[PDB]
Write a protein that binds this ligand. Sequence first.
Ligand SMILES: *[C@@H]1O[C@H](CO)[C@@H](O[C@@H]2O[C@H](CO)[C@@H](O[C@@H]3O[C@H](CO[C@H]4O[C@H](CO)[C@@H](O)[C@H](O)[C@@H]4O)[C@@H](O)[C@H](O[C@H]4O[C@H](CO)[C@@H](O)[C@H](O)[C@@H]4O)[C@@H]3O)[C@H](O)[C@H]2NC(C)=O)[C@H](O)[C@H]1NC(C)=O
Ligand SMILES: *[C@@H]1O[C@H](CO)[C@@H](O[C@@H]2O[C@H](CO)[C@@H](O[C@@H]3O[C@H](CO[C@H]4O[C@H](CO)[C@@H](O)[C@H](O)[C@@H]4O)[C@@H](O)[C@H](O[C@H]4O[C@H](CO)[C@@H](O)[C@H](O)[C@@H]4O)[C@@H]3O)[C@H](O)[C@H]2NC(C)=O)[C@H](O)[C@H]1NC(C)=O
Ligand SMILES: *[C@@H]1O[C@H](CO)[C@@H](O[C@@H]2O[C@H](CO)[C@@H](O[C@@H]3O[C@H](CO[C@H]4O[C@H](CO)[C@@H](O)[C@H](O)[C@@H]4O)[C@@H](O)[C@H](O[C@H]4O[C@H](CO)[C@@H](O)[C@H](O)[C@@H]4O)[C@@H]3O)[C@H](O)[C@H]2NC(C)=O)[C@H](O)[C@H]1NC(C)=O
Ligand SMILES: *[C@@H]1O[C@H](CO)[C@@H](O[C@@H]2O[C@H](CO)[C@@H](O[C@@H]3O[C@H](CO[C@H]4O[C@H](CO)[C@@H](O)[C@H](O)[C@@H]4O)[C@@H](O)[C@H](O[C@H]4O[C@H](CO)[C@@H](O)[C@H](O)[C@@H]4O)[C@@H]3O)[C@H](O)[C@H]2NC(C)=O)[C@H](O)[C@H]1NC(C)=O
Ligand SMILES: *[C@@H]1O[C@H](CO)[C@@H](O[C@@H]2O[C@H](CO)[C@@H](O[C@@H]3O[C@H](CO[C@H]4O[C@H](CO)[C@@H](O)[C@H](O)[C@@H]4O)[C@@H](O)[C@H](O[C@H]4O[C@H](CO)[C@@H](O)[C@H](O)[C@@H]4O)[C@@H]3O)[C@H](O)[C@H]2NC(C)=O)[C@H](O)[C@H]1NC(C)=O
Ligand SMILES: *[C@@H]1O[C@H](CO)[C@@H](O[C@@H]2O[C@H](CO)[C@@H](O[C@@H]3O[C@H](CO[C@H]4O[C@H](CO)[C@@H](O)[C@H](O)[C@@H]4O)[C@@H](O)[C@H](O[C@H]4O[C@H](CO)[C@@H](O)[C@H](O)[C@@H]4O)[C@@H]3O)[C@H](O)[C@H]2NC(C)=O)[C@H](O)[C@H]1NC(C)=O
Ligand SMILES: *[C@@H]1O[C@H](CO)[C@@H](O[C@@H]2O[C@H](CO)[C@@H](O[C@@H]3O[C@H](CO)[C@@H](O)[C@H](O)[C@@H]3O)[C@H](O)[C@H]2NC(C)=O)[C@H](O)[C@H]1NC(C)=O
Ligand SMILES: *[C@@H]1O[C@H](CO)[C@@H](O[C@@H]2O[C@H](CO)[C@@H](O[C@@H]3O[C@H](CO)[C@@H](O)[C@H](O)[C@@H]3O)[C@H](O)[C@H]2NC(C)=O)[C@H](O)[C@H]1NC(C)=O
Ligand SMILES: *[C@@H]1O[C@H](CO)[C@@H](O[C@@H]2O[C@H](CO)[C@@H](O)[C@H](O)[C@H]2NC(C)=O)[C@H](O)[C@H]1NC(C)=O
Ligand SMILES: *[C@@H]1O[C@H](CO)[C@@H](O[C@@H]2O[C@H](CO)[C@@H](O)[C@H](O)[C@H]2NC(C)=O)[C@H](O)[C@H]1NC(C)=O
Ligand SMILES: *[C@@H]1O[C@H](CO)[C@@H](O[C@@H]2O[C@H](CO)[C@@H](O)[C@H](O)[C@H]2NC(C)=O)[C@H](O)[C@H]1NC(C)=O
Ligand SMILES: *[C@@H]1O[C@H](CO)[C@@H](O[C@@H]2O[C@H](CO)[C@@H](O)[C@H](O)[C@H]2NC(C)=O)[C@H](O)[C@H]1NC(C)=O
Ligand SMILES: *[C@@H]1O[C@H](CO)[C@@H](O)[C@H](O)[C@H]1NC(C)=O
Ligand SMILES: *[C@@H]1O[C@H](CO)[C@@H](O)[C@H](O)[C@H]1NC(C)=O
Ligand SMILES: *[C@@H]1O[C@H](CO)[C@@H](O)[C@H](O)[C@H]1NC(C)=O
Ligand SMILES: *[C@@H]1O[C@H](CO)[C@@H](O)[C@H](O)[C@H]1NC(C)=O
Ligand SMILES: *[C@@H]1O[C@H](CO)[C@@H](O)[C@H](O)[C@H]1NC(C)=O
Ligand SMILES: *[C@@H]1O[C@H](CO)[C@@H](O)[C@H](O)[C@H]1NC(C)=O
Lengths: 133, 133, 133, 188, 188, 188
Amino acid sequence: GYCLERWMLVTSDLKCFGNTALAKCNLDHDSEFCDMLKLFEFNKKAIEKVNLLTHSINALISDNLLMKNRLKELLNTPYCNYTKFWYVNHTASGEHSLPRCWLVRNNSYLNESEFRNDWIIESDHLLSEMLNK
Amino acid sequence: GYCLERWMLVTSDLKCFGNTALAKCNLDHDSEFCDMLKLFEFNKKAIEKVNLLTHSINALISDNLLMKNRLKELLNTPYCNYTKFWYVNHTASGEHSLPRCWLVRNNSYLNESEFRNDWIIESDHLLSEMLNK
Amino acid sequence: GYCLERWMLVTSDLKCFGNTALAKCNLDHDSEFCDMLKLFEFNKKAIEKVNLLTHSINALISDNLLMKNRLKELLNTPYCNYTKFWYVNHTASGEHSLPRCWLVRNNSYLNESEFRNDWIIESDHLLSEMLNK
Amino acid sequence: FRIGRSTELQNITFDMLKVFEDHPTSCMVNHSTYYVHENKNATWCLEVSVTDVTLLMAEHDRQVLNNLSNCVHPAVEHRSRMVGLLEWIFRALKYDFNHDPTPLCQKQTSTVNETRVQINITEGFGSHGFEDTILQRLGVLFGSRIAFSNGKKRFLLIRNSTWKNQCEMNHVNSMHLMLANAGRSSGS
Amino acid sequence: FRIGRSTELQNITFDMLKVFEDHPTSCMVNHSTYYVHENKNATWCLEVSVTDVTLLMAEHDRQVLNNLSNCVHPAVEHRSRMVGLLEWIFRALKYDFNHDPTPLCQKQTSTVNETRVQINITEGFGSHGFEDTILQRLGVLFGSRIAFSNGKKRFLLIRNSTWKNQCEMNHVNSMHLMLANAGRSSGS
Amino acid sequence: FRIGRSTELQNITFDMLKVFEDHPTSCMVNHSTYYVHENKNATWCLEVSVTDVTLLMAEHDRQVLNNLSNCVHPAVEHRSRMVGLLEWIFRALKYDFNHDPTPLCQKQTSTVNETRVQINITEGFGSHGFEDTILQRLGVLFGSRIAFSNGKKRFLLIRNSTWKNQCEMNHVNSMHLMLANAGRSSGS
Ligand SMILES: *[C@@H]1O[C@H](CO)[C@@H](O[C@@H]2O[C@H](CO)[C@@H](O[C@@H]3O[C@H](CO[C@H]4O[C@H](CO)[C@@H](O)[C@H](O)[C@@H]4O)[C@@H](O)[C@H](O[C@H]4O[C@H](CO)[C@@H](O)[C@H](O)[C@@H]4O)[C@@H]3O)[C@H](O)[C@H]2NC(C)=O)[C@H](O)[C@H]1NC(C)=O
Ligand SMILES: *[C@@H]1O[C@H](CO)[C@@H](O[C@@H]2O[C@H](CO)[C@@H](O[C@@H]3O[C@H](CO[C@H]4O[C@H](CO)[C@@H](O)[C@H](O)[C@@H]4O)[C@@H](O)[C@H](O[C@H]4O[C@H](CO)[C@@H](O)[C@H](O)[C@@H]4O)[C@@H]3O)[C@H](O)[C@H]2NC(C)=O)[C@H](O)[C@H]1NC(C)=O
Ligand SMILES: *[C@@H]1O[C@H](CO)[C@@H](O[C@@H]2O[C@H](CO)[C@@H](O[C@@H]3O[C@H](CO[C@H]4O[C@H](CO)[C@@H](O)[C@H](O)[C@@H]4O)[C@@H](O)[C@H](O[C@H]4O[C@H](CO)[C@@H](O)[C@H](O)[C@@H]4O)[C@@H]3O)[C@H](O)[C@H]2NC(C)=O)[C@H](O)[C@H]1NC(C)=O
Ligand SMILES: *[C@@H]1O[C@H](CO)[C@@H](O[C@@H]2O[C@H](CO)[C@@H](O[C@@H]3O[C@H](CO[C@H]4O[C@H](CO)[C@@H](O)[C@H](O)[C@@H]4O)[C@@H](O)[C@H](O[C@H]4O[C@H](CO)[C@@H](O)[C@H](O)[C@@H]4O)[C@@H]3O)[C@H](O)[C@H]2NC(C)=O)[C@H](O)[C@H]1NC(C)=O
Ligand SMILES: *[C@@H]1O[C@H](CO)[C@@H](O[C@@H]2O[C@H](CO)[C@@H](O[C@@H]3O[C@H](CO[C@H]4O[C@H](CO)[C@@H](O)[C@H](O)[C@@H]4O)[C@@H](O)[C@H](O[C@H]4O[C@H](CO)[C@@H](O)[C@H](O)[C@@H]4O)[C@@H]3O)[C@H](O)[C@H]2NC(C)=O)[C@H](O)[C@H]1NC(C)=O
Ligand SMILES: *[C@@H]1O[C@H](CO)[C@@H](O[C@@H]2O[C@H](CO)[C@@H](O[C@@H]3O[C@H](CO[C@H]4O[C@H](CO)[C@@H](O)[C@H](O)[C@@H]4O)[C@@H](O)[C@H](O[C@H]4O[C@H](CO)[C@@H](O)[C@H](O)[C@@H]4O)[C@@H]3O)[C@H](O)[C@H]2NC(C)=O)[C@H](O)[C@H]1NC(C)=O
Ligand SMILES: *[C@@H]1O[C@H](CO)[C@@H](O[C@@H]2O[C@H](CO)[C@@H](O[C@@H]3O[C@H](CO)[C@@H](O)[C@H](O)[C@@H]3O)[C@H](O)[C@H]2NC(C)=O)[C@H](O)[C@H]1NC(C)=O
Ligand SMILES: *[C@@H]1O[C@H](CO)[C@@H](O[C@@H]2O[C@H](CO)[C@@H](O[C@@H]3O[C@H](CO)[C@@H](O)[C@H](O)[C@@H]3O)[C@H](O)[C@H]2NC(C)=O)[C@H](O)[C@H]1NC(C)=O
Ligand SMILES: *[C@@H]1O[C@H](CO)[C@@H](O[C@@H]2O[C@H](CO)[C@@H](O)[C@H](O)[C@H]2NC(C)=O)[C@H](O)[C@H]1NC(C)=O
Ligand SMILES: *[C@@H]1O[C@H](CO)[C@@H](O[C@@H]2O[C@H](CO)[C@@H](O)[C@H](O)[C@H]2NC(C)=O)[C@H](O)[C@H]1NC(C)=O
Ligand SMILES: *[C@@H]1O[C@H](CO)[C@@H](O[C@@H]2O[C@H](CO)[C@@H](O)[C@H](O)[C@H]2NC(C)=O)[C@H](O)[C@H]1NC(C)=O
Ligand SMILES: *[C@@H]1O[C@H](CO)[C@@H](O[C@@H]2O[C@H](CO)[C@@H](O)[C@H](O)[C@H]2NC(C)=O)[C@H](O)[C@H]1NC(C)=O
Ligand SMILES: *[C@@H]1O[C@H](CO)[C@@H](O)[C@H](O)[C@H]1NC(C)=O
Ligand SMILES: *[C@@H]1O[C@H](CO)[C@@H](O)[C@H](O)[C@H]1NC(C)=O
Ligand SMILES: *[C@@H]1O[C@H](CO)[C@@H](O)[C@H](O)[C@H]1NC(C)=O
Ligand SMILES: *[C@@H]1O[C@H](CO)[C@@H](O)[C@H](O)[C@H]1NC(C)=O
Ligand SMILES: *[C@@H]1O[C@H](CO)[C@@H](O)[C@H](O)[C@H]1NC(C)=O
Ligand SMILES: *[C@@H]1O[C@H](CO)[C@@H](O)[C@H](O)[C@H]1NC(C)=O
């Protein structure tokens, strides 16, 4: 599917996400990961002068989603700050889920237990879709 | 799924819609019911000071859908006025469909017969999905 | 499904697309064919005075998609100019796919070979969905 | 409603009172007269009318050039709120202050005890289609059909009046008004 | 096109004449000259050009400060329509009348029989990036690539001319223009 | 993280330096002080503060009426860029120049070597809710919570200062700022 470059990530590892996971990007309007992928794709094709990021920022970034996350932050509700995304990855198969946002409260990342139900169902959902094919 | 409070409805009954029906909200961009649910959810979390409804009104309400309904109203075409929504409910099982809007012409609610084909297929659609699981 | 009038097309043939193909229009946000269809439907109901196209142009045409195509054109990348759309059509059955845009580079339509991989998978995709029903 | 032997057609009706109590709302008495209410408990309201008679003349009355707040008497108790509601109406009309005709408001020494803001929508005063633009905005805002009707003088008038329950709150009109004023402050 | 033994590749081409006959449209003769047409049957048009020569000087010509309609002679038969199309262009350029340089238009006693509206896009006249902002708007509006090119004086000029079929109607340009002017009135 | 016997919870963290190096960005030192940076390598920045003390008085200082560029001294090396960043801030605040209070900026003969732009957000100076509108904009722009706090004089002040790494680049603030200025030119 899409394999991100070294400069897009801080872990210094080759991360590539399959087309099966990334196909959900069009279906989901509340994915901040897909928005960040769109920014990185646009900047990637821009790097390889005039910069056209101001014209494409509405097409790449959902204003409503950013606004919702900002309002969640203003009310101390867990919010996405567009930096860290978690996904579930089947170690043996290599199949994974669409990376969801890692929420923040009080200027600190939400602990894994604090969204355990979020990554249980997702894991289960993966283990279900694998059996559908 | 989501169970609405007494003050959100005029019937004075406990109405709750399952997650199976409400999962279609993200998929459908022409659902006014989902928009009204978003308003009620935002107002619910607001009630429990500054009011942030002006910042979130674009994220909760689709401007294009409201505009389409207003243009339909101006041309006397049946339109949604965001007040009454109909759904199909299997009496024994309790499974139901996503509530669709109850259209209005000439300041009067569309009669059930006048959208019979709308609530036949939907009913049938429900009776089909029930057999898929 | 939807059968287009003579004046909407230049080929002077009766073209009608089934509801199975057109059902994908709501799901896909990057379909220019669906936007053009919405535009034609609005103009059709307008023809049969005040013109309300300025109020409905945002609901019918996706600004982000038009902007993306314009930015693609400015950078000489293949783009959609909203004129010609290709689809895959099973000759015997008559089942077809949702018409995708026919891209343009250097003021010239992209040759069929130049998007062969685009209309192979689509064809295959059709031949798969036909077997699912 | 019995659709079939085991399926029923059911409905729910929403109550939007609590959501839109404290926000500006609007209502249509008829296709020419409209009312804008700052909040449910306001004792004052703004009347938006389409009239055929000139009430303010350019020869004797002030024109609004970035000084709308001056159109309200300084002794009015809800002066700031009224100016705010006027701005909400103006932004809801999608008014182009660079190109649209300059609004008129009453003189400082007016004997009448109401604040009047007049917009000349007669054909030829503004650019082509300005009257049609305003009438279609009225249709979008208040659900009016004034635009779908047949060169005489015509004006859009905004005056202040006492709230006398001239209509019922309409949350669709509230949504249109709030969408036109997204990001502003409403709700006390 | 024969994709396989039982599958064919077919195409449809749309005809957008009827949808965009009566609405403003634009066309690009070349990357510097553009034409805006109020409607298909209009005998007049507005030419938008990027020029290297000053045509209006601030010392002798009027500047547009909320009085654009004065730039058209009162005896022109389509004066209101021309002012309307000028406003459509101005809103399509996304012009910031608070911050962008003040446009110039010809003197009242001009001998030349055309209405000229000039915007100074030379580097340093406006804020940083104003020239680039305008050139990228020209690219978005008319599909021009003028922005993707290499301190001399440069202006954006809008003049009025006779329609001589200088281009063919382009419904993508029509869509861009109408999107920039959503909610206005078009179609007679 | 070991979810189960054959499933693992993994994460990725993005690095947004390359995407937003050359675009304007903003940061929040505290809920009252904010900094706007034209680009990462800029030696100057704009400080946006919410203050309780009047610094510019209407009796001695200039008011910004379509002449913001005059608030910057002509001898500043980055004058055009600073005026551009001021316009970016102004558009990010969603400022209504027709209705919002007129900003003040320092006199031409000021002894202090900084350019100050002052907006009076005290209750009653502007329309109802103007202070709340500005404070909620500050919350949306910089992530501030100043609005969620308890009639004294209060101002929004924009001054120019030297960039001293007062904060770290925040690409969410960059996205909010760029969304408010979509279509402008950024990136050299
Ligand atoms: C919002 O702000 C605008 C200005 O931005 C105000 O409009 C001005 O109103 C003042 C008075 O209210 C007007 O001043 C008067 O001007 C006359 C001559 O003006 C000439 O030029 C203007 C163009 O600017 C033409 O419109 C006009 O026809 C003339 O050609 C004088 O005759 C008047 O004299 C008055 O005052 C003197 C004392 O100073 C008395 O001796 C006289 O008897 C008489 O009372 C006066 O000076 C000004 O013309 C208006 N400007 C514009 C552009 O219209 C709005 O009133 C204001 N609105 C609100 C609601 O506050
Ligand atoms: C719709 O909007 C209009 C204007 O925008 C409002 O009408 C104004 O209402 C105010 C009250 O809110 C009126 O102001 C009051 O007027 C009284 C009489 O005015 C006379 O003033 C002098 C007296 O000689 C002369 O110019 C002339 O005779 C006037 O008729 C005064 O008695 C009031 O003053 C009292 O109260 C003030 C404030 O508390 C005290 O300082 C004073 O000492 C005194 O006790 C006051 O000035 C005003 O006149 C009205 N405007 C006009 C043009 O007439 C409407 O009320 C408003 N309606 C709604 C529903 O919002
Ligand atoms: C849109 O509206 C604007 C105003 O909002 C008009 O611009 C004005 O144009 C008029 C005339 O067209 C100008 O008036 C002239 O001003 C001169 C002195 O002005 C000083 O101050 C201004 C600042 O406002 C400076 O720009 C200028 O350099 C000066 O420092 C006078 O010399 C002129 O005298 C003329 O008239 C007298 C008779 O009254 C004759 O005796 C003289 O010979 C001479 O002809 C004149 O008064 C005014 O300056 C302009 N204002 C601005 C802000 O630019 C636009 O013309 C108008 N545009 C359209 C298309 O309608
Ligand atoms: C592009 O835009 C420009 C301006 O915006 C237009 O040019 C103007 O066109 C109008 C016609 O539409 C011209 O007005 C006509 O001018 C004639 C001659 O003008 C003289 O007027 C006096 C006479 O001494 C002097 O100032 C001087 O010599 C001028 O040259 C007049 O004959 C016309 O008047 C006739 O018609 C009117 C109206 O019906 C009657 O009232 C009169 O009695 C008379 O019969 C008229 O005034 C105008 O001069 C042009 N402008 C300039 C600056 O020259 C373009 O036409 C326009 N083009 C397009 C395609 O839109
Ligand atoms: C942006 O542009 C605006 C105008 O659009 C400028 O604001 C003007 O600033 C000038 C000077 O900077 C002011 O002119 C002064 O006006 C005084 C009288 O003004 C009366 O009318 C205005 C209404 O327009 C009232 O605000 C004011 O209170 C008065 O009632 C004069 O006293 C001044 O005289 C000065 O100059 C003379 C020489 O000409 C000297 O002899 C005097 O000693 C004195 O120095 C002067 O003429 C003008 O009033 C301002 N207008 C407005 C509307 O505020 C902004 O300065 C400008 N900002 C930037 C950043 O460029
Ligand atoms: C924040 O923004 C402010 C203003 O917007 C900036 O402050 C201005 O900075 C400029 C430099 O960029 C200063 O201009 C310089 O001032 C020097 C001294 O000024 C005196 O000028 C005369 C001399 O008698 C008197 O009015 C008075 O005594 C002043 O104090 C001059 O030496 C400079 O001129 C030199 O350079 C120019 C240009 O190269 C040459 O033409 C000259 O010949 C000479 O060599 C110059 O004029 C200005 O004074 C400052 N403003 C104020 C109000 O004091 C800040 O720098 C800016 N900060 C950031 C980080 O952006
Ligand atoms: C459009 O904007 C341009 C850019 O600002 C204007 O041209 C500039 O005009 C100024 C004077 O008005 C020139 O400054 C002069 O420069 C010379 C040095 O060559 C010097 O002799 C003078 O004392 C003065 O400083 C400036 O150079 C010039 N810029 C260019 C690139 O030529 C132009 O006037 C504006 N035109 C209109 C119609 O608005
Ligand atoms: C910013 O806006 C505030 C709010 O309007 C301005 O302060 C206000 O200024 C007025 C006079 O200009 C004060 O009115 C005076 O009040 C006293 C009563 O204490 C009375 O003695 C006077 O006759 C007059 O009525 C008003 O009180 C004052 N408000 C506050 C809260 O102090 C301020 O001047 C504005 N500043 C700028 C720089 O724009
Ligand atoms: C998203 O939130 C996290 C905190 O949950 C931020 O990460 C911190 O970044 C700062 C520098 O800005 C470091 O000093 C901290 O050590 C980081 N904390 C952790 C737990 O990693 C991150 O910067 C935020 N991103 C945005 C765009 O706001
Ligand atoms: C939606 O339309 C219905 C009519 O079809 C409106 O219901 C009426 O409400 C008024 C009060 O506003 C009552 O007097 C009528 O008796 C109601 N009629 C029916 C048939 O119930 C409803 O108010 C409209 N809602 C909006 C927001 O426009
Ligand atoms: C879309 O692009 C095609 C070219 O690929 C354009 O088709 C041309 O149209 C012009 C007239 O505008 C004719 O002269 C050419 O012969 C056409 N070429 C082909 C290959 O058909 C089409 O006009 C473009 N449409 C838009 C809206 O830009
Ligand atoms: C699009 O389809 C049209 C038919 O609507 C194709 O045009 C025909 O092509 C065949 C084969 O070359 C000719 O025999 C016919 O005379 C053509 N008819 C017309 C009306 O043009 C056309 O080739 C297709 N365009 C493509 C594939 O770009
Ligand atoms: C938020 O988190 C910080 C970080 O430790 C903590 O000190 C503080 O008490 C928490 N709550 C609030 C309301 O700030
Ligand atoms: C964060 O959550 C983890 C769960 O993996 C837990 O071990 C850790 O103690 C938590 N940290 C704090 C500070 O509570
Ligand atoms: C609309 O409905 C009303 C309500 O009875 C009816 O009187 C009227 O004739 C209908 N048609 C029109 C065009 O108003
Ligand atoms: C409305 O439709 C119902 C169908 O349930 C019908 O019984 C009734 O007569 C209709 N009312 C009118 C006024 O036609
Ligand atoms: C673009 O296509 C035209 C059409 O033949 C061709 O002449 C030209 O070389 C191509 N490339 C560029 C960069 O213009
Ligand atoms: C366009 O592509 C077709 C493939 O069907 C090929 O036959 C033709 O030669 C191509 N045209 C050009 C000019 O390369």
